[PDB]
Amino acid sequence: PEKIRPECFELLRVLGKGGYGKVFQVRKVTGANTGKIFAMKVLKKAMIVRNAKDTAHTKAERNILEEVKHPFIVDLIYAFQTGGKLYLILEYLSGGELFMQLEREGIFMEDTACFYLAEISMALGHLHQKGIIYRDLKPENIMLNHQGHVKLTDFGLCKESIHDTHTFCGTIEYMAPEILMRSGHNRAVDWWSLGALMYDMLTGAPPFTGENRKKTIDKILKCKLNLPPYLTQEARDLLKKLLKRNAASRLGAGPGDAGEVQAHPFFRHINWEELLARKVEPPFKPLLQ
Ligand SMILES: O=C(Nc1cccc(C(F)(F)F)c1)C1CCN(c2ncnc3[nH]cnc23)CC1
Ligand SMILES: [Zn+2]
Numbered sequence: 001p002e003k004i005r006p007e008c009f010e011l012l013r014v015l016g017k018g019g020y021g022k023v024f025q026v027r028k029v030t031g032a033n034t035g036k037i038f039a040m041k042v043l044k045k046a047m048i049v050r051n052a053k054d055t056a057h058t059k060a061e062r063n064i065l066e067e068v069k070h071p072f073i074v075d076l077i078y079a080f081q082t083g084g085k086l087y088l089i090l091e092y093l094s095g096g097e098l099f100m101q102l103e104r105e106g107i108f109m110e111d112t113a114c115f116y117l118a119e120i121s122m123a124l125g126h127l128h129q130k131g132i133i134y135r136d137l138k139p140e141n142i143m144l145n146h147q148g149h150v151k152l153t154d155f156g157l158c159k160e161s162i163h164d165t166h167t168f169c170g171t172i173e174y175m176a177p178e179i180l181m182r183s184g185h186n187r188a189v190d191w192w193s194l195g196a197l198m199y200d201m202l203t204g205a206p207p208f209t210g211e212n213r214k215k216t217i218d219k220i221l222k223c224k225l226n227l228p229p230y231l232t233q234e235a236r237d238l239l240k241k242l243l244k245r246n247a248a249s250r251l252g253a254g255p256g257d258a259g260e261v262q263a264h265p266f267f268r269h270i271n272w273e274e275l276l277a278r279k280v281e282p283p284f285k286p287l288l289q
Helices: 045-050 055-067 098-105 110-130 188-203 213-222 233-242 258-262 272-276
Strands: 009-017 021-028 037-044 076-082 085-091 142-144 150-152
Touching: 009 037, 021 085, 037 045, 045 085, 055 076, 098 142, 110 150, 110 188, 110 258, 110 272, 188 233
Parallel strands: none
Antiparallel strands: 009 021, 021 037, 037 085, 076 085, 142 150
């Protein structure tokens, strides 16, 4: 049996740092996967007990996450606790954030947006089946692997550096009204957020923005959707079906879940079997760019 220790990993570079802890790119230097590169998160258990909402919740989420096998969800490989720290060993993802692609491109062609949103919808469908709600599809929460395919990566504890309960840490621009109102929610919040992300991809900004936090929340709650005249009929129709205040009435909120969204005419050109098999050419290939 292999004894996993922090000493099994050499540190290569820092990928992130915050109040809860720190993320490293690492190389495993002993055991079966000697030489393989991973992402290693190191969380301060002392900090976790302090800043929290429900550790049982986030623990259960990571418990499920560890067992998930899906091409568009991050692989949480090992998890162990020694010292006063929690170590999470994940697959290393070299393609950067979807945020970075949007920053570069300004806005996406509809075919580009369609590709990413399609892969994301399959990840969401799988998550819901396994009992996970993603909550927040801000483009920083979606990474790309070396090929340019989506990996959902933001689970469990709040990874923000500047905090605020952790609902309002970081941008709330992609989160459903009922999360912000703390009025109770379910997987329908994910289809809202997919819509907010789609809107950002196609127009350059999330749907509801304010000069400050208070005004932004007010706009999200009012949910007065402004549909740009320059987007296709299919894009506008999907957006109006996702970005609805009535959570129950969102496309995807019914019993078919992701199947409802995937059937929409906006995705008419997607071959879902090829997409899942990652046989569809991504719009952007990190290794080549
Ligand atoms: O966790 C992160 N940031 C962060 C920021 C502050 C604090 C903390 C914490 F306390 F949790 F440790 C974490 C990001 C997660 C996604 N990232 C990955 N980068 C590369 N391979 C990856 N494989 C899986 N994820 C990635 C980049 C960083
Ligand atoms: Zn926080």
